[PDB]
Amino acid sequence: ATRIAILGAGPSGMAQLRAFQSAQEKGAEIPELVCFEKQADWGGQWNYTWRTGLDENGEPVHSSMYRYLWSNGPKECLEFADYTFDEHFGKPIASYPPREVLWDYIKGRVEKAGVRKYIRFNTAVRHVEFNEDSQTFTVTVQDHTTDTIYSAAFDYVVCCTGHFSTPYVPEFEGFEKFGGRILHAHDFRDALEFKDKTVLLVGSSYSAEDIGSQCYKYGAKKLISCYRTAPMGYKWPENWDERPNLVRVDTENAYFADGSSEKVDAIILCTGYIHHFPFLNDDLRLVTNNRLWPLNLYKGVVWEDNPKFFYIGMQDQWYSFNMFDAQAWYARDVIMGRLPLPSKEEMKADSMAWREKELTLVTAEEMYTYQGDYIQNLIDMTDYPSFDIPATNKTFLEWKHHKKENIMTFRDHSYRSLMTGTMAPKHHTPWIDALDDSLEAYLSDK
Amino acid sequence: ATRIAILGAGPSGMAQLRAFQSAQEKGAEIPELVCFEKQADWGGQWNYTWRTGLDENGEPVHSSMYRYLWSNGPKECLEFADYTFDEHFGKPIASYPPREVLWDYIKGRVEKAGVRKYIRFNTAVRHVEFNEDSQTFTVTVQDHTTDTIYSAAFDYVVCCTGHFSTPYVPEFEGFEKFGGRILHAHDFRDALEFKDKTVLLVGSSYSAEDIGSQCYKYGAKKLISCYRTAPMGYKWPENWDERPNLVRVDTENAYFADGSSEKVDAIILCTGYIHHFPFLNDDLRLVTNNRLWPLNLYKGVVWEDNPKFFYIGMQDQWYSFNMFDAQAWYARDVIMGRLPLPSKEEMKADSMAWREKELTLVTAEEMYTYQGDYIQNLIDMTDYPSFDIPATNKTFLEWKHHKKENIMTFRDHSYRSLMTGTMAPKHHTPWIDALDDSLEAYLSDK
Ligand SMILES: Cc1cc2nc3c(=O)[nH]c(=O)nc-3n(C[C@H](O)[C@H](O)[C@H](O)COP(=O)(O)OP(=O)(O)OC[C@H]3O[C@@H](n4cnc5c(N)ncnc54)[C@H](O)[C@@H]3O)c2cc1C
Ligand SMILES: Cc1cc2nc3c(=O)[nH]c(=O)nc-3n(C[C@H](O)[C@H](O)[C@H](O)COP(=O)(O)OP(=O)(O)OC[C@H]3O[C@@H](n4cnc5c(N)ncnc54)[C@H](O)[C@@H]3O)c2cc1C
Ligand SMILES: CC(=O)c1ccc[n+]([C@@H]2O[C@@H](COP(=O)([O-])OP(=O)(O)OC[C@@H]3O[C@@H](n4cnc5c(N)ncnc54)[C@H](OP(=O)(O)O)[C@@H]3O)[C@@H](O)[C@H]2O)c1
Ligand SMILES: CC(=O)c1ccc[n+]([C@@H]2O[C@@H](COP(=O)([O-])OP(=O)(O)OC[C@@H]3O[C@@H](n4cnc5c(N)ncnc54)[C@H](OP(=O)(O)O)[C@@H]3O)[C@@H](O)[C@H]2O)c1
Description:
The structure is a homodimer of 446-residue chains.
Chain A: E1 3-7, H1 11-25, E2 32-36, H2 85-89, H3 99-113, E3 119-120, E4 123-131, E5 136-143, E6 148-154, E7 156-159, E8 166-167, E9 181-184, E10 198-202, H4 206-217, E11 222-227, E12 240-244, E13 246-249, E14 253-256, E15 261-263, E16 266-269, E17 273-274, E18 297-298, E19 302-303, E20 309-311, H5 321-335, H6 344-359, H7 364-379, H8 389-405, H9 439-443
Parallel strand pairs in A: 1-2, 1-7, 2-3, 7-20, 9-16, 10-11, 10-16, 11-12
Antiparallel strand pairs in A: 4-5, 5-6, 8-17, 13-14, 14-15, 18-19
Helix pairs in contact in A: 1-3, 1-5, 7-8
The structure holds flavin-adenine dinucleotide (2 copies) and 3-acetylpyridine adenine dinucleotide phosphate (2 copies).
One 3-acetylpyridine adenine dinucleotide phosphate binds next to helix 4 of chain A.
GO molecular function, one term (chains A, B): N,N-dimethylaniline monooxygenase activity
Cofactor (chains A, B): FAD
Binding site for FAD (chains A, B): 12, 37, 39, 45-46, 62, 72, 125, 320
């Protein structure tokens, strides 16, 4: 009786469970499933917590999400092909929902699927070891409800623990004497903490854009963004400027490669994350920077040194929810014997060709399109519903232009669903004025 | 060739190395020693970092220490019996040195001992397993310098990883709505971050007393302390009050079991720590609250279910540095065969009698005196130099009275060394006015 361990109940682990349940619903015999989740509820990043650093059990706090976060790209680019926004909400809604709204949506699918029963919440995965003599994995966990550590044997293991939770936090000279708060983006919670302050944001990617936008929207006095290689380059509001990189700090001031200098109240390092798996030894352990094509993953999913071990969602993410689906459906089919694996040599050659293409990429359009091609290849192999990928790529193109037009109003635009054709209505309140982030305020009138 | 693993190079792991080195200096053959330390330098808590949450490798940040921290008790109560303050500094100093000064002192002893060579820095212990078949331990670590995970075999393991680093962080109704910073004492770094703010401190023990004192000294507008059981009782300054526990928080305000309420800018949970050992399964893992006599430790040191495993410094700490010495010398002597262990039944009965006495303790004096008795029993069994414990107890008595007299000036008093007899002079600057926490300002004549 074959047995599967799924590590994590975020979007990826939820998709993995959904994938199996869907095969079962069609009448197939499926493996026994156990899913381990260290948090008290599913949803992963989208499960908000006020906690910071270490959680109530002493495990690293997982979510990096903050008050007032809304979708960074069109919801239409992340809609599940087997569970639409229309089905879930019963009505059209706008295109960039707040966190709690997206959280409600991803949970809706697995509530309907009835797969909560497979999950052991409040349980941290400590160790995964492969045993050569038995060809099984031993998974060791800590159940923080009973405060006991136990282990169990599995035939296959699917790792869904994310890669945007363990921060990359570089040091700058003087940090030990600066008098204001220093935090990583991962620790950022309520933008109101910085009302009427001067905030320095170190970095120039999605985290800097959006955390600065929150500080702006909720009333920071002044924002400074500094970049290591090139500026974000958007037209920012009046109280926000982009400088070349921080070089040092003193008691109160930041100094930049500019020769400029000024007083700053708080420093937020928006400097990204590391791939970190403390429960894996080197035989199973993925080591990569954040990118579209990590190596050693056949079809981006199958660990090439031991193809009884799988990874979901370890790539950088233009696409997200329906990419995890495409991967989870594929992992499922491999595990079930529907898609036999080629030799290790063929895997290696295939992965090298995908890496060669990855190194070629220059524009944003080339990047999301490459990821669409990856997804296309996955959904063609499986009964996951095909959806219109070139039309999703075109939605990304529109979104890109909207950001360039005006970085503060991109969230005020609407797109059509590629699953239903339903056009998103305009939201009742422009983003800059929509201060309440609750699901109730978003879905109600006003 | 017998082999020992020492887990941690704070004061306890340094003492364990010092104990073995001292035996060797006297002419004995010692085992091979390997010490693993996840930080880049030794000193444990006393090694200051600006970092918070997770460290540069993604390991939990260890030190809970903050800017401007000074010794909480007389230095005379923590003086090494084999390496005096007079030897280290070459002159008298006042009785409550700043963190950097005490760090320099603890490093001084192990610099002189030459024990740096046994330590692998930037290396995090992941797992310790005991193999019944070989009667050895397998220690698996991650070397963050080479990003390599490897394991090695040991005959004995001494755990020195501390118990004041994994926070106990209780949740209060409304924390997910509150607009200012919420942090644990463990994340507290520079008190200047709170200058001109209203700060609520949840708790009523050493962390609350001292973090409040720092916020006060460096210019917080207003301080509130709230207690769960009973108030700290000291006479606080004008802008600081104590009241019954927090019950809930909204967007801007804290509400107390009082019926009282007010606007607060930051909340600091001074609610203590948990014993947390993510690298130990239940066969080896100590489970206890913070107290003078944890169970399952023969002489407070030998793990009773597997007496080839040892714990140093897991008790609550009135005494500290020379308690770790007493423990480390004892662990050393059992490892080397100088002090054969009694049967498991005898160990149990001994530990029970120590626990029975512990539950008897009511006053502060009874508590440090019991810990003095514990230490006496250890140093009598070993060649650690005897020192005057009743005279150390009388120094605690004076310190207690000084705190009762005035909680803001207790650090301005001086005591005599029980090791050398020499009186500590008065510091050049009253604590409230000594804003500079550097070693250089402290040791200078002005
Ligand atoms: C700040 C931020 C904003 C984002 N915004 C968007 C957005 O607007 N749109 C979008 O499409 N994507 C966004 N993302 C991307 C995000 O990666 C995905 O949307 C999605 O959350 C990834 O799903 P996942 O399940 O792979 O990983 P995660 O959501 O990270 O979930 C991993 C799960 O693994 C669990 N886990 C980890 N370690 C252990 C362990 N040792 N034991 C047991 N359980 C463990 C965690 O508790 C968590 O539940 C954002 C990410 C961040 C960090
Ligand atoms: C805020 C605060 C203030 C204090 N003030 C005083 C004071 O004024 N006077 C006093 O006498 N005592 C004070 N203490 C008490 C403190 O417990 C002791 O002084 C002393 O530091 C205990 O030493 P230790 O080596 O047992 O533990 P620690 O100092 O905590 O050191 C443990 C070592 O283990 C390492 N480690 C942990 N986990 C791993 C791992 N998995 N792998 C590898 N290495 C690991 C850590 O990096 C660390 O170096 C204070 C404690 C705190 C928290
Ligand atoms: C479709 C869409 O909306 C989309 C597409 C992709 C990703 N995402 C989102 O983006 C992700 C989140 O993205 P992220 O911004 O958290 O992290 P990254 O993007 O990896 O880069 C931060 C990096 O930080 C900077 N940095 C690193 N070290 C630095 C240093 N020493 N000094 C100054 N800056 C430093 C880097 O600059 P440099 O390396 O010099 O440029 C780079 O800007 C996820 O949340 C995902 O959801 C969304
Ligand atoms: C000789 C000497 O100087 C000495 C002696 C011992 C310790 N220390 C130092 O003190 C240590 C550090 O001591 P610490 O204050 O960090 O931790 P503890 O003392 O364990 O208690 C915090 C606890 O927090 C309170 N608390 C817990 N949950 C609460 C809740 N839900 N609401 C309100 N309050 C709550 C407890 O109240 P309650 O439980 O209700 O009282 C108690 O006050 C170390 O730094 C050590 O160096 C020094």
